């Protein structure tokens, strides 16, 4: 029952087509609670969860300022990178930054992280100790030395150890209405005959939280080692998630096949067959 708080930042330069766009999204586990977008009508930080809109006006003001200040830093960060890599001023470019903290099942701090990327490629990451950096290339090493002189590692370490964790417990408690209870998946098995000899069995898992789930097919109660036809887990669009696994079986002997579902909301793994 580990919990996390995460912030995803995206800065995209668009030469000729105006100022660089800035997006920031806030996550507690798999729930998005806060949003910033430079192209948005309201240039401020916006609530996305029921338990976040509880917060006062100053909260929204400081968090707007925070993202707005980050917007400036990444604006020049894009300008610096063009020079580092001798890139043309004409092309679009991307910087990404994901930071955050995790708490343990007891409540105590488990992990902190701060990773960055230029044009999809790794650039600089704070080490697991929260004291050292790892640069990906020679340009990122110049960035590294500058950040070590500026004590950025020490300044983020204080935030994760102090503020980040403290706010996470707060959101969890205020959000235990939705956050601290896992939604158990609705599982069904459907039958689709392709021909008179064979038939597709589909294992549906719908309306679950969190996103993590394992669907495993079994014949005669024996596991299927090799890849099965399945889809990458997708959002239902209401906070819950969806996934299905499909196998081709001979018609008539559908009883010999069972779907084995592993999910956090389930105390014991759930077994499903064609009803």
């Amino acid at each position: 029952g580990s919990h996390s708080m995460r912030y995803f930042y995206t800065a995209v330069s668009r030469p000729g087509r105006g100022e660089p766009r800035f997006i920031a999204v806030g996550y507690v586990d798999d729930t998005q609670f806060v949003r910033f977008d430079s192209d948005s009508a309201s240039r401020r930080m916006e609530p996305r969860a029921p338990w976040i809109e509880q917060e006062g006006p100053e909260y929204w003001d400081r968090n707007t300022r925070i993202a707005e200040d980050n917007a400036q830093a990444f604006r020049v960060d894009l300008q610096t990178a063009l020079r580092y890599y001798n890139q043309s001023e004409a092309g679009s470019h991307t910087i990404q930054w994901m930071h955050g903290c995790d708490v343990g099942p007891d409540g105590r701090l488990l992990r902190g992280y701060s990773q960055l990327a230029y044009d999809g490629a790794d650039y600089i990451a704070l080490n697991e100790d929260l004291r050292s950096w790892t640069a990906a290339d020679t340009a990122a090493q110049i960035t590294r030395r500058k950040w070590e002189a500026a004590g950025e590692a020490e300044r983020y370490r204080n935030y994760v150890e102090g503020e980040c964790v403290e706010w996470l417990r707060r959101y969890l408690e205020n959000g235990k209405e939705t956050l601290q209870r896992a939604e158990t998946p609705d599982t069904r098995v459907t039958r689709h005959p392709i021909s008179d000899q064979k038939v597709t069995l589909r294992c549906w898992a719908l309306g679950f939280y969190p996103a993590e789930i394992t669907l495993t097919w079994q014949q005669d109660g024996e596991d299927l080692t090799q890849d099965t036809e399945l889809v990458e887990t997708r959002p239902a669009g209401d906070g819950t998630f969806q996934k299905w696994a499909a196998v081709v079986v001979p018609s008539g002997q559908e009883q010999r096949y069972t779907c084995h579902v592993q999910h956090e909301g389930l105390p014991e793994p759930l077994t499903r067959s064609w009803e």
């Binding site: 912030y7 930080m45 925070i66 020049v76 930054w97 960035t143 950025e152």
Partner: peptide, 9 residues
Amino acid sequence: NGYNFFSTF
């Protein structure tokens, strides 16, 4: 809440 990032590239 969010984290201010002062240093740049």
